[PDB]
Every structure is written in C-alpha cells, then in structure tokens.
C-alpha cells in the first residue's frame, strides 16, 4: 500500500501491442459522413440521472482549441448531433472538391492540417489556407515547419521544433450539474489545458528545454506517441470538480494515465491486443517544483506502478464519476508511505527485473529495467466480480502469533463504532403451545390446601420487566383471538357419560363477559364472527353471543361482579380482567374471582357451563372454588394457552346446578407443578436480555460487536488491525461473524460485525495470551459488498431441529461439571465447544481425528488436543481425567465403521475400563418408549435396529435399552446408571436466548420427541445400584429391591421436579401404588409400585437424621402398545342411527377423530361419530366419506396423534346403495358436480345453485367443517368429479 491504496498481490500487463494504422483521405472522407454507425464522437451519459451531460472527441475534431462561444454549438446532445452533421457535410463537398476522388482516395494524408482545418471551420476562420497542406508529401512534421499559415494560435514553428496547441478532449454539456455520477472531464474542456511540442528525435527537445520555462511539468509519451516524438506541458488551468481538492492541470492528465493504466492492466489476455503497452505519462523536466509530500508526487509514483503491471484491489466503475475519483484522490492523501521499492528519478522509467511488461523490447529509448529491483509477486490478473447486497459470514483462521489481551480491548475501544442502536428482533416465533387437565375420579383425592401457592416475589418490579420484553418480542396475531379459539375448541370436546355426548351443542345461548372492543377496528372480540361462520372445525355455531363489559361497543355495558339484570344463557364464557377492578394486591382480587364465579354460576342455566380466566391463582381462591362450586357441577376442565411467560389460566365447568363429588386430584397437582416451574425458568431467562430498544456499548450481556477499519491495508506490516479483528474474535469466537466491505465518505472502509454472549466471554476467560489471526483471507478480496444495519435477534425463521438437539443436549454437560474438574471429552469438534462451556479452571482433552482449528499458545490453563480415535486402543494409560463425555456421536462412529450399536457401544466400555475416570456422560442411540415415527425428521425400522435421519440422509443402528445396561453392569458392578430427562425441562433453553437464537414452539416439540429417542446415559462408577425386578408398563405392577441400606433412611420419587411420593408418608402418596419392606436380615429394601404416565421417574434417598441427599439411580416407566385392531359388520346402517362397529384398545389410550385438509389437521365433527362402552364407535354414512380419509387419534398427553394415528383405510372402501336413501355433503372448498349414472344434476358450493324439489337439507350438518350443509338424496347412483 502507498498512503491508503491496497493493491493487489498480483501484476499484470498487456503484451502484444497493436499494429499502426495511417490515416488516409478516403478514411477522413468516410468518418466525416458522421452515420448513424460510427460518428466522430462519443456520448457520456451520467450515472446516476442516466442523462447525457458530455460528448468524448475523437480525430477529426481534435482542434476546438478557442472558446466555445466563438463556436456557437446548440444546447442538446441530439440536437448537436444533427447540427455537426448539417455542418461538416459542407465541408466535404468542399474537401472533396480540391481533392478530386478519383486520384486521392488513398493518398497519406497529415492529420494536424485536418484537424486544424476543421477546428478553423467550425471557428469561422479563414480555413482554405490548408487545403494545399492536406496531404503529406515527405514528412509529418517537415512540411508543417515550412509555411506561415493560419491563425498561428493553432501552431507556429521555432526552429527544427513545431509548438503546436493541445486540442481539446470533452465537450461539456448543458446538463452538467457537478454531480457525482456526473463525469469528470479532468480539465480536458476549457480553452486551454496543455501544449504539444513535436518535432522528430528528443534530443532537439531537451534543447529546446534548456530554454523555456519547465514551471508547469513536462510529460512524455515514451512508448507510442499519438502522432510523433514530442513532449507535453499543462497550463495554470485547475480542477474544481472534484470536491473538496483543487486539481492542477498537469496533474489531470497524470490523473487520466493513471487510471487508464490501471484498468487496462486487469482486462488483459495474453493474446488480446491493444493500441499501446503503456499509458502512464512520465515527467521528464520541471521536477525541481514537485515536493516530496505535493499530490503531484505521489501520482509520479502512481504512474510508476502502474507502469510496473501494478493492479487495483478497489474495482473501477467502467464510467468514472465524481465521487469515484475523490475518493481515490482522497485515499492517496492519507497518512502512510511509499512501501514499495519505486522510487522516481528525472531520468527515465526503471522496470522491475520480474516485471510483466514488455516495453524494453518493444521500444528503444526512455526505460531502462533493473536486475536488483524484484517485486516477489505471483503474476496474473484479478477476478472481475461484481458487487454483494448483504453481508458475508466469515470465518477467521487463527496462527500461532500472540499478543497482549490488554492491547486488544485497548484497540477495539479505539476502532468501533459502539454505542449504537440495533433492531431487536423478535425471540420467540411460531404459533401458541396448549396445555389443559381434565378431572378424572382414580386420582388420589388432593386437597385444596397443598396446591402450589403462587411466587411472593412475582410483583417486585424486576419480574414485571421481564414479563413485559418476553410480551413484547412475540412473533403472533391477535392473542384474544387465538386464546379463544384455543379455549372454545377444547371446550366442544368433553363428553358427558351420563348422555355420551358433549355439553356443548350448538344454538347454546352464549355470553361472552368481558367483551373489550380491540382498536383492530372490528369493535368486538374476534373470534365471534369466525365462530358463528363456522370457520371453525369442532365448533358449531351458535345461535347468538351477547356482549358485556367495561369497553363493550356493540353489546352493553355493566361492571359484572355486582347484579346486573340479563336473561339465562346456556354457555358463559369469561375474558374478564381482574387487574382493573379492586385496588393493587391479591385479596380484593381473589374476592372479584369469587364474585364473578357466582355471577356466572347465576348466568347459567342449569345443566349449562362456564369459562372463566384467572389472573393469579392463588390457595385460597381454589379453597372457595372446592367449598363452594366442585359439588355444583358434573366434570370441569382447566386450560392454559401460552403466548407470554405469564401465570394467566382458564377454569371450565359443565353441568351446572347439578350434585356430584368432584374434588381436586392428582393430575391438578402436577399440572399446577409444571405450570409454575416453566414459568419460573423462563422468567429467570428472559431477565438477562437487554432491554427492547437499547443501546449496545459492550456493558449488555447480549451486544452487536462492530468494528471497521478506513482504508485498510492487509499486506505489509500492519501491527494494527492485526490485533484489531483478533481482539473482536477473541470477544465473540465460534459465533456466526458477517463483514463487509465498501467506501463511506470517500474512505475504503470495512466492517465486522457479531455477537456476545456470556459463554462467548467465557471462553476468554480462559486464555492467558491473546491469539492470533492470519489475515490472508482478506486481503484477497477484491469485490465490494455493502453494509447492513444491526439486528441482533437475526433469525427470521426458527432455529431448526438438530441445533436445538445440540443445545438441549450441551445444557447437561455445562450444567454437570464444576469447577476445576479435570476433564476428558471425547468426540470433541474441532471448533471446540467446549471450550466456550466450562469453568475457565478446569482442564480439558480434545480426543477427535480431524486436526482443530483452535489455537495452542494462549491457554492460562492446561487443554490438550489429539489426533486419533477414541474409538481405537492403546491410548488411554496416559491421560488423567474424572468426567468423561461423547454426545451426538457414537451412533455415526458406529454406522461409519460399518459397526453395530451393541458391538460400538461395548468397545467404548472396553477403551474406558481400563482409563482413571469417575463418572461418564454418553449419548447412546436407543429408544425410551414405544417405538414410533417422528414424521419427516426421524423414521425408525423396527427390522433392523436402525434410525433414519432423513434432512441428513443417513442410516445409523440402535440398540435396547436392558441390552445396553447389562454391559455397564459387568465392568463396573458399583454402576449407578440413571437416564436424565428432558422432556419437560426449558432450563437447557437458555444456551439459545442469551446469543440471540429465535426460538419456534414446533421446533422444542420435535425436539422432545427426538430426544425420546436419543437419550443421555449418566453413569456413576460408585454410586449405589439398583436392580428393576418386575414388568415396568403403565398399567402393571412394578418391584424394585434397593440394597444396602438402614430402616431409618426414605427415598423420594420425584417426576417432572414434582414428587410422587415418599416412603415415610405412604399414604398420602400422589402415585396409584405404593408398597414398602425391609430385610433386616440382609438390609435390602423393597418399593413395590404401580406408577399411571409413561416417561422417567427418579428415586433419591435421604439417609440420616440429616439434610443430606443422595440420588440414586432412576427408571422408565413406558405406555402400553399403540397396536389398534377393529371390527366392521357386513349390514351398514345407512340410516339415523347409523352402523356401529368395534374398536379393540388398550383402555389407557383416549381415541378421537381428525381428517387432513390443505396439510392442516381439522377436528372432525363430534356429531358424526361416537364412541361409547368394550367400546364401540357410532357413525352416520355418507357418500362424502369416500372421498375424504380418516384417522383416529390420541389426545391423552399433551401432544396429539404421536402414538395412534390410524387411518379408516376401511371407510373409504365402502360400497354404496342405490335403491336407498341417503345422507350427503360437500367433500371440501372445491367444486364437486353431482351426477346419477354419470349425468349432472346440480353443483354443490356454486353461485347460484338452486336446491332440487326432491333433496332435502338435516338439521345438524355432519360435514367436518360446520358451515357446509348436508342435504337428503334420493335413491340411486351417486358420482363426483373434481374439478
């Protein structure tokens, strides 16, 4: 770099120099006919207004050389197109007139007296004092020394030398408005600019020189003259359009051939070839006015290397404007030095010995090449790329070199561009998630007073303002909206056994409390008009809604929990704030909640229900829910949508006014556990985001790290972004780091740009010197790319699947190690993970095969690296170590080696046994449960123990779960071997939020689901074992003996962080089964169980009369088979009634029905089949049923259709009457024609059908969307077509 131009590493130079051509009579006549083909001109259209604001000369018309007024030119371009060619027409018929055609057409004619004379023409002037001067008799220069001839301020002759006068090179325009994309004419328009002195050898010129002032510069054009040896000297003429310098006149021409040069040198081929070799202009007398720091200087140095086959790293826009030009002008006049080894000197051009040009052969006189003047430099040219819209991620390789971590910071406070303001982004995306519980009479009998009581602190002010940037970061619609519609779908499916049907029919007259307008302009709740269309499936539309509430607009108003006179509804749903009425703390709220139950209670009628939201739910609000409505209804519900980390929830009633014995049970104990758990991870998570339109100074946690260099400069010692990016890098490693690449102000500038995070800092932690960064991935950049603007929360879409896999899965390790153990992981990746996750004292060995990226010299403390197998012998002897690791590994180690699960797995325990470990963490491939199929993300042969991943295109094998643990038991007999869970945690959650990692609901289901499958084995060598002795399946008896114990310890069991139970209460033991002996003869303990949900459960024990707690090993209870067989009579009840047909399930699976439309699970109609009690399923027929599938499905956990989703492949092989009436309805949205023996009668969905006089419409439409009617056909054939 010289002053603030990064050039390029690589030289190149045209090489074969274009023949000469001479100008000829018949080609001055041809040009002068100015054709539409090829005119004398050239246009220049600006580059931002795409208007033309000059015109480039050519020859002829090299001698406009007076002011333009005496010229008299029109004012548009077009319109001087014309002008010249009505003009100079004239002076062919004259030209042609002396010179006769026949006898001249290819005589070798001068071009100075043709442009002279067409200069005076144009001028007015006396102009036939050349035409006997046309041709060329002997010489191109002796004839012009002989005769006086006209206006001599053309050319005069002063001895053996003719002082001609530089002719002009742009035209400017009346359009030119000094813009930027306007061109810069380089002070090549006004009067006059330079003079050409010619004659035939230079040494008559440095004569000529020796007397005549050199104050101006005096160039030369060594290589090829444009018409003949001469010399060259510009005016005081000076350079105003490029703001804010003042070019000199002498110095636009050298400005010109510089750039020219430059982009000449990029274009070349080694077999194109051009008009000169060289361009560059060089001065050759009047130096002694050039000072060592003028601008004048540095582009006699410029023209040097450029000369020198030099090359540009910065692109050239193929039309210069005037921003371009001072930019570069302003990149040279930076602070810097002339790095290269050319130097100038008054004597003449030096070559580098290695240089790609060739002028020293093609010429004679004026260059003269070196032998010790070698410029290292991989030749050839640069790659011609075009610009990039957004920012590029980047990945820095890292060198041995260090430096001093108190030098970095010191930098990065010096270069970046912090504080500024980024754009937030959203944390959250994807729909809602919903949970509920139902009431079920086997639960223990819980008690209204050992419900969790909700957090103390939950009003203290910081809470609140996580509450309020979870709230505000949701990517999601009309949130009452979508509550409701969550609410009222689940409320249209709970069945009352006393009538086998749902509380919910349609027409119920229904009150919607709490009516608040929403400024969305509907005025009303929005999802009345949804609801009412039917747009809903499994919700029938009403018969109406009455609106009330405080900011009601098209019902009434009234302040409900006093008594307001209304009519009997038959459903009351509630959307009543509580956070209004009563002033600020919970008394006088848990007072409004009971008010506004017995206002409802009264609205009912009997037999009805109700829907009510609870703002904080608190003990003593569910001690007067059971003292004063449980025993006033038949079943009730609870439901909560989660949209916003909050504690909002939903209360549901049927059978009002009607005597039963319901109180809370067991799955209200549990559920009230999770829905307070969850709540309070996310809100310890969300408290540490900075807060929603901040400013990132480098204080937040979170932050956009930004840091840009002006002008920089890659190759040379630099000494000082060096250390610049390597401090970033060192900030922010191992996360996704974007740069850019452009020029701000007239400055090169670029840019980096990432993003810290506390794991991210962590890993700093742990160096002791700063590492380094090899910076050749840089400088190679010749392309331009712009910048962007900061967003922190980046992603726009959800972090998919396998990521959030990692991460969940990352969360056990990090959390499991404490500080200063040694530890040994396996598997490592050559980023190094775990460098970013542990404590910054622990020591660590990365045991992979490909090499790593990640430095050796900087590290305070002790981190080895390997290269070899750790699936192979003979290595472990050496290496100390206490927790040892191998996560998303082992299955693809064992698939690649073309090995099994079992024989994998064995090795390892092999490789380990004879190691110095203490505890091991191992992902092991191996199911957890039923086996099932996650759709799309995980298929699962149950032939051959193999996986499948399809978004990766690979087939691993597994293994079982009691095959696996048999072989832990035989190397370590004091195995303790537990299956830590996931399926309910969030905690793991938080290795996302604090980077900036968008979260999608559907991607944390799915990774539940595949972590049913992909489990985490943490293995004690020492722990306390435990044997399962009986069938362990929902349903079935359980045993477990625990030895070596005293009968004055307990055990705990916990599952989701609740407790099933403990051993020194057996009663009051919230799991179906308990059982407790002791062998006092051997000491052996005995819990004999039967256990109600699928998953893990965990034992722990409590020894002594002590706080102290041991854990013990834990166990997997899984469901029973999700096998489904049915029974289907032969007479079909195409009737009312309708055929009843038999189901064979396992009693634990709850069974519904759905049907997939548009891709999307719509709920079928609860009017179109029923089940009942063995069990049998009703069902009402219909032609519709042939074209449309349906599946039975399980809601019985959260999720829905994971375990049983069977198509009635037999429903849509029916065989239909045809001297018999039938039910029949639409299919779909599409336009289905009817036809009786393929003949069309009417159109079902068509504008304007009309209703047949023999079909008739039912009462209650058993389509699977309620809008759609169904109608009564008449005996006979029935066909549809699509259409």
């Given at each position: 770099n010289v002053w603030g131009v990064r050039l390029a590493d690589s030289l190149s130079s045209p090489t074969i120099e274009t023949r000469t051509r001479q100008y000829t009579l018949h080609d001055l006549c041809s040009d002068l006919d100015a054709n539409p083909g090829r005119e004398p001109w050239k246009p220049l259209r600006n580059q931002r207004t795409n208007n033309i604001v000059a015109v480039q000369l050519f020859r002829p018309l090299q001698g406009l050389v007076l002011d333009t007024q005496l010229y008299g030119f029109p004012g548009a371009f077009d319109d001087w197109e014309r002008f010249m060619r009505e003009k100079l027409r004239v002076l062919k018929y004259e030209v042609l007139r002396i010179y006769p055609i026949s006898n001249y057409s290819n005589e070798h004619v001068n071009v100075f007296v043709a442009n002279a004379l067409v200069g005076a023409f144009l001028s007015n002037q006396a102009f036939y004092d050349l035409l006997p001067l046309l041709i060329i008799n002997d010489t191109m220069i002796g004839d012009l020394l002989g005769t006086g001839a006209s206006l001599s301020q053309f050319f005069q002759s002063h001895g053996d030398v003719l002082e001609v006068a530089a002719g002009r090179k742009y035209l400017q325009m009346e359009n030119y408005s000094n813009d930027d994309d306007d061109p810069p004419l380089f002070a090549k328009d006004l009067s006059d600019y330079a003079k050409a002195f010619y004659s035939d050898t230079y040494e008559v010129l440095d004569r000529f020189f020796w007397t005549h002032d050199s104050s101006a510069g005096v160039l030369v054009h060594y290589d090829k003259p444009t018409n003949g040896h001469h010399y060259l000297l510009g005016t005081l003429t000076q350079m105003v359009s490029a703001p804010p310098y003042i070019i000199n006149a002498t110095d636009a021409m050298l400005l010109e051939s510089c750039l020219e040069q430059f982009s000449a040198n990029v274009r070349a081929r080694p077999a194109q070839p051009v008009t000169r070799l060289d361009q560059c202009y060089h001065l050759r007398w009047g130096a002694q006015y050039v000072g060592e720091d003028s601008l004048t200087y540095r582009l006699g140095v410029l023209s040097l290397l450029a000369t020198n086959g030099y090359q540009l790293a910065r692109p050239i826009p193929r039309q210069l404007t005037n921003r371009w030009l001072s930019s570069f002008v302003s990149q040279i006049m930076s602070d810097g030095v002339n790095e290269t080894p050319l130097w100038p000197q008054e004597r003449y051009v030096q070559i580098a010995y290695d240089s790609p040009s060739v002028v020293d052969g093609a010429t004679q006189y004026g260059y003269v090449r070196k032998n010790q003047l070698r410029l290292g430099m991989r030749i050839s040219a640069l790659q011609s790329l075009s610009d990039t819209p957004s920012p590029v991620q980047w990945l820095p390789q890292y060198t041995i070199d260090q430096a001093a971590m108190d030098e970095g910071d010191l930098m990065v406070s010096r270069l970046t561009q912090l504080p500024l303001r980024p754009d937030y982004g959203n944390i959250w995306v994807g729909d809602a998630l919903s949970y509920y519980v139902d009431y079920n009479r086997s639960h223990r009998v819980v008690l209204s007073s050992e419900l969790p009581q909700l957090p103390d602190t939950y009003f203290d002010g910081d809470e609140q303002y996580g509450r309020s940037l979870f709230s505000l970061a949701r990517k999601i619609g009309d949130r009452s909206l979508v509550k409701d519609t969550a609410v009222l779908k689940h409320a249209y499916q709970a069945i009352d056994p006393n009538t086998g049907k749902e509380y919910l029919r349609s027409g119920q007259s229904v009150a919607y409390f709490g009516a608040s307008a929403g400024h969305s302009g509907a005025d009303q709740p929005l999802v009345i008009e949804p609801w009412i269309q039917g747009k809903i499936s499994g919700v029938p539309p009403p018969s109406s809604v009455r609106q009330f509430g405080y900011d009601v607009a098209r019902g009434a108003i009234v302040d409900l929990a006093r008594p307001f006179p209304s009519g009997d509804y038959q459903f009351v749903y509630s959307d009543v704030d509580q956070v209004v009425d009563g002033h600020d703390d919970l008394s006088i709220s848990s007072g409004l909640v009971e008010s506004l139950l017995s206002s409802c209670m009264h609205a009912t009628a009997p037999g009805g229900s109700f829907v009510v939201k609870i703002n904080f739910p608190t003990r003593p609000v569910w001690h007067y829910i059971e003292q004063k409505i449980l025993p006033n209804i038949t079943s009730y519900m609870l439901i909560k949508p989660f949209v916003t980390n909050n504690v909002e929830l939903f209360f549901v009633a049927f059978g009002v006014h009607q005597h039963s014995s319901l109180t809370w049970t067991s799955g209200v104990y549990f559920f009230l556990v999770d829905h307070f758990y969850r709540y309070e991870t996310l809100s310890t998570i969300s408290r540490?985001?900075?807060?929603?339109?901040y400013v990132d100074d480098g204080s937040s946690v979170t932050g956009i790290e930004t840091i840009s260099i002006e002008n920089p400069g890659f190759s040379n010692m630099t000494q000082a972004a060096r250390i610049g990016i390597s401090g970033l890098c060192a900030n922010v490693g191992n996360a996704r780091k974007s740069i850019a690449i452009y020029e701000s102000h007239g400055a090169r500038v670029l840019t980096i740009t990432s993003r810290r995070s506390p794991a991210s800092a962590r890993r700093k932690s742990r160096l002791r010197y700063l590492p380094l960064i090899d910076p050749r991935s840089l400088e190679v950049q010749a392309r331009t790319i712009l910048p962007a603007d900061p967003v922190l929360f980046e992603n726009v879409s959800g972090a998919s699947p396998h990521v959030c896999l990692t991460m969940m899965y990352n969360f056990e390790v990090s959390s499991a190690v404490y500080d200063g153990d040694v530890v040994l992981d396996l598997g490592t990746g050559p980023e190094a993970k775990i460098l970013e996750l542990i404590p910054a004292t622990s020591p660590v060995t990365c045991v992979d095969i490909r090499p790593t990226a990640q430095p050796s010299g900087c590290w305070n403390v002790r981190t080895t690296f390997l290269e070899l197998d750790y699936l192979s012998d003979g290595w472990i002897t050496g290496v100390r170590g206490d927790i040892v690791t191998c996560m998303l590994s082992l299955g693809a180690a064992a698939a690649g080696k073309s090995m099994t699960f079992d024989a994998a797995f064995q090795q390892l325990i092999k490789v380990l046994s004879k190691s110095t470990a203490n505890v091991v963490l191992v992902q092991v491939n191996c199911p957890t449960d039923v086996v099932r199929s996650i759709k799309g993300y995980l298929e699962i042969d149950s032939t051959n123990k193999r996986y499948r991943f399809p978004k990766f295109g690979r087939d691993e094998p597994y293994s079982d779960m009691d095959a696996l643990e048999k072989i832990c038991r035989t190397a370590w007999p004091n195995c303790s071997i537990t299956w830590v869970p996931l399926s309910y945690d969030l905690r793991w959650t938080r290795l996302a939020l604090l980077e900036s990692t968008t979260l999608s609901s559907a991607s944390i289901r799915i990774a539940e689901l595949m972590y049913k499958y992909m489990p985490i084995m943490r293995i004690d060598i020492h722990g306390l074992p435990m044997e399962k002795r009986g069938n362990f399946i929902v349903g079935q008896n359980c045993s477990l003996v625990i030895p070596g114990f005293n009968a004055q310890d307990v055990f705990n069991c916990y599952f989701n962080s609740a407790l099933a139970f403990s051993t020194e209460d057996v009663n009051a033991a919230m799991i179906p089964q308990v059982s407790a002996q002791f062998d006092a003869t051997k000491g052996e303990w005995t819990l004999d169980m039967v256990f109600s949900d699928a998953g893990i459960y965990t034992m722990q024990a409590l020894v002594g009369s002590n706080a102290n707690p041991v854990s013990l090993g834990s166990f997997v209870v899984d469901s029973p088979d999700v096998d489904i067989t049915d029974a289907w009579p032969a007479q079909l009840d195409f009737t009312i009634a309708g055929t009843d047909v038999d189901i064979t399930v396992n009693p634990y699976y709850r069974l519904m029905t759905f049907v997939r439309i548009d891709g999307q699970w719509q709920i079928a109609n609860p009017d179109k089949f029923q089940f009942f009690s063995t069990l049998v399923m009703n069902v009402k027929l219909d032609i519709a049923d042939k074209y449309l599938l349906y599946y039975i499905r399980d809601v019985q956990s959260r999720d829905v259709g994971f375990y049983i989703q069977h198509p009635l492949q037999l429903l849509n092989t029916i065989t239909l009457p045809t001297n018999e009436d039938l039910f029949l309805s639409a299919p779909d949205m599409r336009e289905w024609a009817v036809k009786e023996s393929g003949n069309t009668i009417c159109i079902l969905n068509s504008q304007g059908f009309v209703l047949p006089q023999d079909w008739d419409v039912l009462t209650?439409?058993?389509?699977?969307?309620?809008s759609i009617p169904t109608y009564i056909v008449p005996p006979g054939d029935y066909t549809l077509t699509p259409l």
């Open positions: 540490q985001l900075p807060s929603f339109g209650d439409t058993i389509s699977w969307s309620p």
